[PDB]
Amino acid sequence: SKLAGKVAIVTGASKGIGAAIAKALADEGAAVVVNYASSKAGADAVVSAITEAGGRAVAVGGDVSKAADAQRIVDTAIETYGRLDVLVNNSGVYEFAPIEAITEEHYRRQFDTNVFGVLLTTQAAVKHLGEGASIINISSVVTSITPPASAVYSGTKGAVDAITGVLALELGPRKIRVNAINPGMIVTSDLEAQVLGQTPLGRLGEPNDIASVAVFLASDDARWMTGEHLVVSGGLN
Amino acid sequence: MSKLAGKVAIVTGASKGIGAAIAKALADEGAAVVVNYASSKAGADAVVSAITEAGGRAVAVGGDVSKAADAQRIVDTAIETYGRLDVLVNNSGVYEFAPIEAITEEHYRRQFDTNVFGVLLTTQAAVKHLGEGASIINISSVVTSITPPASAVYSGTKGAVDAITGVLALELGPRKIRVNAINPGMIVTEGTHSAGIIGSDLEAQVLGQTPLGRLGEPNDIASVAVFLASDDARWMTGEHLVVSGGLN
Amino acid sequence: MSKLAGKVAIVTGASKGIGAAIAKALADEGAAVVVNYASSKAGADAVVSAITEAGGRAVAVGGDVSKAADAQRIVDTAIETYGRLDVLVNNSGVYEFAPIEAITEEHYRRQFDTNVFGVLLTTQAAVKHLGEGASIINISSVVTSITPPASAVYSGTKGAVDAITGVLALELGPRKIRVNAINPGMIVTEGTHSAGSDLEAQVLGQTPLGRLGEPNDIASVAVFLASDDARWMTGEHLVVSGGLN
Amino acid sequence: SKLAGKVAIVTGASKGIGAAIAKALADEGAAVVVNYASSKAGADAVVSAITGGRAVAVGGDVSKAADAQRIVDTAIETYGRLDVLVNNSGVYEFAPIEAITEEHYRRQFDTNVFGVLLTTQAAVKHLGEGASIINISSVVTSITPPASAVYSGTKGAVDAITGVLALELGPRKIRVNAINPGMIVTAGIIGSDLEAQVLGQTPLGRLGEPNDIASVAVFLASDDARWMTGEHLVVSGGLN
Ligand code: NA
Ligand code: NA
Ligand code: NA
Ligand code: NA
Ligand code: NA
Ligand code: NA
Ligand code: NA
Ligand code: NA
Structure with missing residues (x-):
């Protein structure tokens, strides 16, 4: 298993993309701290699924925009x-x-x-990270396609892309990798039909389309990649 | 003919450095310029006197662009003046x-x-007065390309600016308002290259990676701003022009 | 003051379209222009006549840039004239x-x-005469950003031009020679917009600024890049497509 | 095994990056046609190393249309x-x-x-839903080093071709992506001096090895990359 003995935190992981990444990491043998902002029951179901299949996981509530919560999420990993x-x-x-x-x-x-x-969350985590560690920031394809009416959202993702590249350089000497995944629209209307029509691979994305890429980046298979932004959108850029 | 004859520009953060040079260069091409400053009134007054002494029009206005009321007053100043x-x-x-x-x-x-x-x-307040042919120029930074260590917040701000430039290019395209970014390299005091000064370890490190063999000075950016402001750039929107002497 | 007063430019493939408009626009800023054509002598001669009748200097020279001897003659025409x-x-x-x-x-x-x-x-031949403040402008294409179906070769070539521009910027930077690219969108006959095909319609629908590009849209960016206004830009690729990328 | 039942062609596979990719792909269940331009021994060595799996050496120069076709026919025939x-x-x-x-x-x-x-043109006849084309390009398309105009030009063309074919073959659900490797150690003072200069610019603090590229190829070949097409993955230890 690619992540045997390793421990992962996934923020925003009660549902959708986050949930799928937590499960796929566990499937490769990581113990997973499943952080949720909203729905506790979703997170508990992620933990239950991991543990039923022979893995280790623990749910932890918290809002990553609050310094104390970010710290508590990281502590959970270490204390557990x-x-x-x-x-x-x-x-x-x-x-x-x-x-x-x-x-x-x-x-x-x-x-x-x-x-x-x-x-x-990254600041809190970096205390515990050493050689071989991998930080994966979930950004968005909007940094490439920058749609109308998305200035703030795309703004945030543009910031994530830049932070990814900064930390790749900053943390490189410590051999900690930092990459982004830039997903397309992922289904868990007019927009869906429009996006479908612009998607070369002929379908809408699903959470596990992102999960499999996160596992790759988390693993030693990506040991020579850092500072990259992988667009995972079925060809839309 | 002056490229910006009969036009009006706002330059935010224009008391010094890049913004000051941009204001002067826009005025040189016939634009009247609202010189906004955050806290150096003296700096902005100097830029206005330099503009008017050279035969142009300009007016200083103080205000914090992060406060909606000040953003609106900066824009009102253009329309009122x-x-x-x-x-x-x-x-x-x-x-x-x-x-x-x-x-x-x-x-x-x-x-x-x-x-x-x-x-x-500032953009939100301005767009109610922008029509076809208008040009918004966002000053970003070469850090969105080179993303140096210890700049996560700063570079993050400029990544955000780059993406906002793309969004508003698409969003404002049907109104024929252009939106583009300039991504300056490290900029040093005007006269530095003529004085032969390498001021600091950081300057030396950036200089060693700069193909054109010096560091940028404010007028290096200003001339690009005028370009993007003018009709010469009429078929460019959503672009990010790295202006760093070749460092990317 | 004319931005290119006293300078000399070569424009390859300048008998029509983008090339022609670039030649006229450089001469409008005071450059003397070597107008190179591959086939259409009459196109180049009319570009030249247009320039000389507006008070500038220009000369036509026929040649195929893909042949070393012709590339060299194009350059020698600048120096000799x-x-x-x-x-x-x-x-x-x-x-x-x-x-x-x-x-x-x-x-x-x-x-x-x-x-x-x-x-x-052509660049190889020219570099023998370029010094500080020189500017090399490569005409690439927006296809390097949008890479459309059925353009593998063409887009391949422009992708190569994009890379060569970045290499030569680093390579010639110590000599203070700038090297940049323009990446035009689809450009149609001058006057098509003011006058009012399915591919044209498609590309128009995808163009944020609401029309298709015309040769002067590219020409004015070429003048900028040729001039001292762009002295702090090298290795860049400017997409000039009315916002399509 | 991620590529159980699948068949792969790897061109210029007698040494270095290509050889490591060939062994990595067969390690995941794929039968590999190992093309070599010259070093039959290297290719045979790679095939021997593979035979847990299945592999077959084949000589040919992909710039020559008939050789490219014969590489693909070798896959289908074997x-x-x-x-x-x-x-x-x-x-x-x-x-x-x-x-x-x-x-x-x-x-x-x-x-x-x-x-x-x-090679791509020969191959596409035989490719269906879920096929994956991987073009090995180079970090030079990002860093464009002096004295590399022709070599970087080739790689810039490969990057663009990748984008075009991703869109062109999208309707057939064939994926097309590039890896852009950094310097991979696989001479004299020139090689040593270059190696030190690149090391110093490499954030992860060593030089690249062939398996650093191989493992990314296996990802792109696999279904784990089923929602990526038209991408160009820089694998240089952080140099861009
Ligand atoms: Na875009
Ligand atoms: Na695209
Ligand atoms: Na970079
Ligand atoms: Na660079
Ligand atoms: Na694209
Ligand atoms: Na776009
Ligand atoms: Na570069
Ligand atoms: Na870099």
Whole structure:
């Protein structure tokens, strides 16, 4: 198993992409700290699924935009499993608005979680990370396609892309890898039909389309990649 | 003929450095310029006197682009003073470096509020007065290409600016308002290259990676701003022009 | 003040379209222009007449940039006629589309030889006369960003031009010679917009600025890059497609 | 096993990157046609190393249309199918602009570009839903080093070809992606000096090895990459 003995944290992992990454990491033998912001029951079902199949996992509630919660999520990993190897920053929220409608709260809520939350969780994690560790930031294909009415959301993801490249260089001497995945629209309307029509591989994405890439980046198979942004959108860029 | 004859521009963060040089260069091409400053009134007054002494029009206005009321007042100043608005240069920006271990909430908020939110607020207030042929220029940074260690917050702000540039290019395209970014390299005091000064270890390191063999000075950026502001760039929108002497 | 007063430029493939508009636009800023054509002598002669009748200096020279001797003669024409060389615009280029199944050796070679080897041979000849402040402008294409179906060879060639631009910027930077690319979108006959095909319609629908590009859209960016206004830009690739990328 | 029942072709596979890719893919259950331009011994060695699995050596120069076709026919004749193509066959030569010749241009573009197009063209007949094409390009398309105009040009062309074919073959659900390797140690003062200079610019603090590329090829060949096409993965230890 690619991640035997390793320990991963996945933020935003009660549902959807985060949930699928937590399970796929466990399938390769990582113990997984399943952080949830919203739905506790979803996270408990992720833990139950991991543990039923012979894995180890633990759910932990918390809001990554708050320094104390970010720290507690990292502590959980160490207090429960004694080590940390992989961080998946997946906690993200989204809201669209044209330039005329953008409010301060629209700006703050998204930057606080999508950017400051990545920084706080990563800062907390870095204390425990050494040679071979892998940090995976979940960004979005919007940094390539930058759609109308997405200035703040795409703004947050542009910030994540840049942070990924900074930390790759900064943490390189410590041999900690930092990469991004830039997913397309992932289904867990007009937009779905539009996006489908622009998607070369002829379907909409699913959570496990992202999960398999996160596992690759988490594993030693990606030991010579850092600072990369992998667009996982079925060909849309 | 002057490229910006009869036009009006706002330049945010224009008391010094790049923004000051941009204001002067836009005025040189006939634009009347609202010189916005965050706290150096004396700097902005100097830029206005240099503009008017050279035969141009300009007016200083103080205000924090991160505060909606100040964003609106900066834009009102253009319309009240000159009757119209054609060019917005979002240059207000602050910078601070820190490794991941030293990042704090205030370090994060201060840079994002000014370098991101201030761009959105100023642009939001301006667009109600922009029509076909208008040009918004966002001053980003070469850090979005080279992403140096200990710049996670700063570079993050500029990544955000780069993506906002793309979004608004698409969003404002049907109104025929252009939106582009300039991504400056490290910029040093005007006269540095003529004085033969390498000022610091950081300057030396960037200079060693700069193909053109010096560091940029403010007028290096200003001339690109005028280009993007003019009709010469009419078929460019959503671009990010790295202006670093070849460092990327 | 004319931005290129006293400078000398070469524009390859300048008998029509983008090339022609670039030649006229450089001369409008005071450059003397060597107007190179591959086939159409009459196109080049009318570009020259247009320039001289507007008070500038220009000369036509026929030649195939994919042949070393012709690339060298194009450059020697600048030096013999005007004494110097400051600006090279590598615009000569051909295109042909074809799906992978249909690609032929001739379809590959003709495009690579003109679009890539021609740029190399011309730049090579020019560099012998370029000094500080020189500017080399390669005409690439938006296809390097959008990479459309059935353009493997053509996009291949422009992808090569994009890379060569980055290499030569680093390579010639210590000599203070700038090297940049323009990556035009689809460009149609001048006047098509003001006047009012299915591919044209498709590309128009995908263009944020609401029309198709015309040659002067490219020309004015070429003048910028040729000038001292762009003195702090080298190795860049400017997409000039009305926002399509 | 990620590529159980699948068949792969890897071009220029007698040494270095290509050989390591061939062993990695067969390690996941794929039958590998191991193309070599010259070193039959190396290729045979690779095949021997493989035979847990299945493999067959084949000589050919992908720049020559008939050789490219025979590489693909070898796959179909020996194993009945074709699922993965790795276009690795590459020559490299460096020269500053003053030193560029017609022969230096042609030999690189013929193998690094026309050979990719010929081999791909032969192969696509046989490729269906879930097939994966992997083009080995180079980090040079990001870093564009001096004295590499022709070699970086070839790789810039491969990057663009990758994008075109991802969109072109999308409707058939054939994926097309590139790896952009950094310097992979696989001479004299020139090699040592270069190695130190690249090490110093490499954030992960060593030089690349062939397996560093191989493991990424196996990912792109596999279904784990089923939602990626038209991508270019830099595998350089962080140098870009
Ligand atoms: Na885009
Ligand atoms: Na695309
Ligand atoms: Na970079
Ligand atoms: Na570079
Ligand atoms: Na694309
Ligand atoms: Na786009
Ligand atoms: Na580069
Ligand atoms: Na880099």
